[PDB]
Amino acid sequence: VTVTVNKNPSHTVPSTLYGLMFEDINHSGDGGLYAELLQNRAFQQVTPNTAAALAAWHPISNAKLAVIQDPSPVSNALPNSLQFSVPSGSSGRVGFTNEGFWGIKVDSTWTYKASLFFRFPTSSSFSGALTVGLQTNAGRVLAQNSTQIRGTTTKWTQINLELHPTASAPDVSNSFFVTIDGAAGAGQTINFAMFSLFPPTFKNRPNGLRADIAETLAEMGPSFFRFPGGNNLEGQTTATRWQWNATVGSLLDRPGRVGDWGYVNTDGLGLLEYLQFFEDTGMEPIMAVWAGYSLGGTSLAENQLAPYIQQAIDQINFVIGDPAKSAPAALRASLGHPEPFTLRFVEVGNEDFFAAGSYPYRWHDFVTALQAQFPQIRFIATTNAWNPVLSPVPQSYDVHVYQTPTWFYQNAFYYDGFQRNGTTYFEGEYAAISTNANDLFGTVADGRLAFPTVQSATGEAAFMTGLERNSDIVFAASYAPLLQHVNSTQWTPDLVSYDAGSVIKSTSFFAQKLFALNKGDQYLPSTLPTNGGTLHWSITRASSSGKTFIKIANAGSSAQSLTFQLTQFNSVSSTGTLQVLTGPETASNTPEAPQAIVPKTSTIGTGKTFTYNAPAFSVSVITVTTN
Template sequence: MRPLSPLLTVLALAATRAFAQVTTTVSVSATASHAIPTSLFGMMFEDISVSAHSGDGGLYGELLQNRAFQQVTPNTTDALSAWTPVGGSSITVIADPSPLSSALPNSLALTIPANSAGQFGFANEGYWGINVQAGTSYTASLYYRVASSIPSGKGSAPPTLTIALQSASGTRLASHSVSLETGGWTHVSAVLTPTRTPASTANLFTVTVSGVPKQGLDVNFAMLSLFPPTFKGRANGMRKDIAETLFEVRPAFFRFPGGNNLEGQTPATRWQWRNTVGPLTERPGRVGDWGYVNTDGLGLLEYLYWCEDMEMEPFMAVWDGYSLDGESVTGAALDPYIAEAIEQIQFVIGDPETSEPAALRASLGRKEPFALKYVEIGNEDFIGNAPGTVASRWNQIVTNLSTTFPQLQFMATSDTGSPVLTPTPQTYDIHVYQTPDWFTTNSFFYDTFARNGMTFFEGEYAAISSNSSNIFGTPDQGRFLWPTVAGSAGEAAFMTGFERNADIVFAASYAPLLGHVNDSQWTPNLVGFDAGNVFKSTSFYVQKLFSLNKGDEYLPSTLPSVNGTLHWSVTRWTSTSELVIKISNIDTSPASLTFVLPFKNVESEGTVQLLTGAATASNTPEEPDLIVPTTGKVKTGETFEYSAPAMSVSVITFGAK
């Protein structure tokens, strides 16, 4: 055999050394250092902001877009968004002289010309389509008012109004007909059950009138609606497939009504709880902070029922005097807004016998209070606020709220310790959007925080870009359209730091949660969707792996290298004596670990759940299941080895006591 050349000898020695270097020994303690809070992993929601149509057209079950012509300018083309005429009719959104309600001043005016035969009306395209499935019951409803006279007498049959679902090719899939009546606003409700499933979601909701008198006809329509079956059958509830996807994660909490969407572009356009409760006909909606209308059909009461249906704890925010245009309300001018915040909280937890907002809640069918522990004061007060303004508003708001609700904890949203706030916050909400590498190297972010009774909520975090110098740039500048394997593995490294510091980090939520693939102003999102599909990202699977396997106490172990690419945490379920080891490897090569356990009774085999793939790989609408977790077996024992694949997140579980 020929001797190796000098170059090959060097390469062989380097390979041997490299192999030795990637073996890491992890010694685990038998004694827990702290409990893992049940609230550690949850969800943050931004209602129709940041991620376009995450509420309306997304989580909220309503299938019709622009259903009530809220906050639009009458007699404009934009006011007819999503609506088109059918037949030779004419449609216009008008300021109705006799509106359905003061909250909904506009209606759609249908004009059918004289001497018309056939069907005339209008159609709604939904939110980039309507998913229609055979055998599924869809609840349709509308209000109409005949604005012109209808001939009566012998031989004069009233015109017929037909509500229908129609395929893109014009095939009627389901319908319901009634005779038109005169005399003010009339409500029509029907259950439409299609007998066939069309080939695509490019379907229409149609309203047509036939049997029109010779002189023509004018009919006004308001508050049109189409609902599919909702999550857990909740009236005015959530889209079932999206809700069921989120329920897979078993989130511990839900932060609402969102970050920026709480604030408003001005104080007058802030999110206002009273405008989001009561009958849908009494909700005016608002122009959201990203330029389009929020119906507020998903309102305060719906949020609270949703939390119960999902078995989540509500984290609710109140407006704190700061709007996105930079305006701060301070001093005596802030008092009415503090009163509004108190009323909002009273609606949630107050006694109907002593509180008007709580009595309103009871009148809407919910006498008993909801569970509430955490209230967030504003959103991201570390952006655009003068420090003195932040401090004065915090003092004024929290002093008042804590006097009224001493049992609640109030979260600050300014930078921790800057400015100094009085009273001292019990909790801070921290947000960070960064690169995969940043999240990996900052796994120790919370390790140096003081243990002084203060706790922390990582309310928004996500790896959104590969470009550290332009995090919020465009896709051609490194911004991710979808979460990547490298980003998700980096987030997992950061999340092991949550567990290691769960004595002070009590909650964390990836953000944003949802994004419609046809219209999203923010990328990436945890879950994507269109009219008929839900797309689970690689980061969704990481959140699910951590949430379902968090354990209830943390076991200290050998610490990872602060600047390394390999991170881990060890937790335990005390009731089952099951050990949970989570490992993030963001390196392009596998990493070998040897675990040394202090237990004598260790199962010889464990389960490993593994998410791995190319660093830039993503789940997309074109390849929705490109990267999914796999489940296998791994040999375990008092001492065992595990090779973490390159670009991977591993969760190993086994019995040990």
């Protein structure tokens, strides 16, 4: 096909076009992006004296363990303690382990920070060393450090010790341990609370993020981060919804909550750690507020909304508020960031098409109150576009789609027929998730993708050429879900996978990266792709440099020739760079083959005419300079 490129731009490409969607799903927060290595570190939101309260904790030798409702808890937010008892006539090594999130990476090039709170609930004459460390799950000690404690310490006391492994472990089957001498400790009871083990973090942030994962997210060159959900915003009930103020301050004062994907969230990954990450990576937030629906199906009545609307104002004030004019903004200042963060976009709930009967009044009351307080923010509606009819008229809608790779290339013209009437569109969640049009959300056996494929990434890429062409009205777009702990998965496929040890960059991650890193501020119209066809392209240009990005998706099984005509330009560089992602249709990056499919960069001959054969199932970027 001959593709003529217009030199005259039709519109400016929004700076927000490509970004990330985040919620704590598949342990993407606790156990993923958040660097904490201990699972169930503070016994949050568990029933005392049950097996489930001890999840991830194990005795060493004849140790007796119980999670108790502590008569004198470490904090109001953390009512549960680990009661550790050493029986009469004990000897040798007695204590307990934490198995982490299906392992702990033990690396001799890393210094770890271990902490805990302890008290003797009954004063005793005990005198001896408390030892913390890392061991293989055979009990081989790889790191250890200790400090002296006394049974006379009846008040909550923090221990902080660094750990230096003597050797890197050969795998991630390692645990954190706490031990005392069984003979010196015989007959003693110690209460523990608020455990923590950190590796070195992204940008050495206290309470920060896991380095390989954070770096991988930054590598994609995202412009925005949508958070904190997604379903993990909503809760199962009003009482279990995400609440911003429970996520800020000292870890002692964060009660945690039952999230929406089968596990407790520590809320260690809280609003300030989100905002610090955005500052660290140059992303801006698309921040959701809870809007009076929870996933159990309960809507708040119209006459119940006032306190929840005020809590949303509180959340936004923590982010952007003048510290002299509200308590939430003064709190941001007191936690060491008096300067306001950037916030230009707020989403009102998540997927309120599940509650379209109540959203009209929830949308009306939330947006009228929030737009009056924050006249510069653009509010995003989460119902299906224009059904139901909302008041005020939404400036923006969040559109979600999960479909076959084939659907994505067949629907690259999704936005072309939309009216241009001041509404902008956020493609807040999309992914090609299955090859079975009849059972999109079913099993892998029935066509669900365990990981993104070349087929799924190339379908997506064809759909994304539509998003770029239509970026006069499409302002933002994110794949979902972003992150997957392969040892605790609730949803596939995911953009980036990992275990305790290493990261897997999917085919879809490379499509996202190639689209986001190779994007100009000008959209250059070109010959339109066939609507319904497998072959799609989108061209942008950097006004300041003339760098010109030709993005080509071949989402079909046939190679296709493109002849580009740039005759309207004064000059075209005599060479260009080619970046191509291609492979077999069903090929995936997996834990067993994490580099099976990766992009290849080369130099090609260019000018006012050149020909490129786009292989079957390929994403290609050709960069030339034009003036």
